[PDB]
Amino acid sequence: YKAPVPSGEVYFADSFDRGTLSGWILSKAKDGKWEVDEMKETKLPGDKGLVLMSRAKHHAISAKLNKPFLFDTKPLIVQYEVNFQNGIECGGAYVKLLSKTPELNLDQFHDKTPYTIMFGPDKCGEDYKLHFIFRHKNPKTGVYEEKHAKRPDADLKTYFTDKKTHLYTLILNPDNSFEILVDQSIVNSGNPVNPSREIEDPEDQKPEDWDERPKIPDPDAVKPDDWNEDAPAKIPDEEATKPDGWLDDEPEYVPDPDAEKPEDWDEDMDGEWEAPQIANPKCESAPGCGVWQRPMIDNPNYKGKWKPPMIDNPNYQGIWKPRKIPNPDFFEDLEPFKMTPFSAIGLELWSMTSDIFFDNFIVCGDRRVVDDWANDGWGL
């Protein structure tokens, strides 16, 4: 079967139902490429999606929205689906909402291209992350400070290994609060962080007389006389004896009969050749070779080193700290949701394995209009 058609407005939605990555722009900045076929071993004869396919760096692809999404009297809703068909070792398959600007040379989709929000799955080695970041404009320095969003309560792993297509929803209400419904289940929610507070005088110094040492050695207890601290942990076994067929003259190891410093070697500093030692064979059929070593047994009188007991330090003036002195770059927490608008949705992804499946890219402001395209697309 198949169907999924827009309900209300658009902002951006793409189902690749047409069948082509018609309408997407490979970067040119500076690799891997993309295609739009069915799912590997599908189960839906018709739903093909934009799919990564390499190991190089799909650092590319993006597309212009249908209309600049501004952050005012409508919340933001973005949602797509991915599915690491070959499971991800270490890579990312999150979306990037390219900010608005006069001429947005997409084709030049650089890496430090300004975006407004980043969002989606990423997991390297064994971290399993589902991001959501929204760069805030330092309303003073004017610096673009990317404010993250705490992890979710729920392990994610499964979503990256069950080689089965999952869905990601992102909703940011002007409230300045959110949640990250993934496969319908809101796995995360909320409402560094934009405004600040103070700072400490980096010109303050932990004085030397300031003791931050909880416990200390009881200056009373003293190393006992029997505690000979110079006694080794090992002393020879005078009970032992040197086997008889032992070869005192036969040299432990011998220089290998392949001793040839490659005519590619530069003693001048490729080091200073030395023929690897082999292993004098004469010894193979012998008790031992070269200088004998009377085996060591443990040592009865070994002790260690004076272990004076620890005791609280009557003067441990708690761990010292800089004397908090005012906030110059002190800014403010407006209605954050009023972040710079974006005009494109792109994907600069590192990755590792191929066959990553992307699809149903949809971006609307209404929740229903989005909840439908969902049960329409993914729901199928």
Nearer to Ca ion, 47 or 122 (CB): 47
Tell me, by CB under 5 A, how many residues bind Ca ion: 5
Structure tokens at 94: 């999150």
Spell out the long-range contacts of 265-269 with Cβ–Cβ below 8 A and sequence spacing 24 or more: none
Is 15 known as a binding-site position? Answer: yes
Nearer to Ca ion, 172 or 362 (CB): 362
CB-based contact 355:150 (threshold 8 Å): no
CB-based contact 354:55 (threshold 8 Å): yes
Q: Residue 47, interface with Ca ion (CB under 5 A)?
A: yes
Chosen residue from 16, 80, 94, 378 binding Ca ion by CB under 5 A: 16
Chosen residue from 49, 121, 336, 346 binding Ca ion by CB under 5 A: 49
The nearest distance, CB 366 to Ca ion, in angstroms, is: 21
Is 164 known as a binding-site position? Answer: no
Chosen residue from 12, 15, 92, 369 binding Ca ion by CB under 5 A: 15
Nearer to Ca ion, 132 or 378 (CB): 378
The nearest distance, CB 356 to Ca ion, in angstroms, is: 14
Chosen residue from 81, 359, 371, 376 binding Ca ion by CB under 5 A: 359
Nearer to Ca ion, 167 or 289 (CB): 167
The nearest distance, CB 81 to Ca ion, in angstroms, is: 8
Q: Residue 99, interface with Ca ion (CB under 5 A)?
A: no
Q: Residue 165, interface with Ca ion (CB under 5 A)?
A: no
Using CB positions, name the residue nearest to Ca ion: 359
The nearest distance, CB 372 to Ca ion, in angstroms, is: 15
Is 355 known as a binding-site position? Answer: no
Structure tokens at 193: 């962080």
Give the Cα-Cα-Cα angle 102, 12, 42 (nearest 5 degrees): 135
Nearer to Ca ion, 336 or 377 (CB): 377
Site string for Ca ion, 286-325 (x = CB under 5 A): ----------------------------------------
Is 96 known as a binding-site position? Answer: yes
Nearer to Ca ion, 39 or 187 (CB): 39
The nearest distance, CB 24 to Ca ion, in angstroms, is: 13
The pair phi, psi for residue 116, each rounded to 5°, is -105, -45
Nearer to Ca ion, 359 or 376 (CB): 359
Is 115 known as a binding-site position? Answer: yes
Binding-site entries for Ca(2+): 15, 47, 359
Binding site for Ca ion (CB under 5 A): 15-16, 47, 49, 359
Binding-site entries: 15, 47, 94, 96, 115, 122, 348, 359
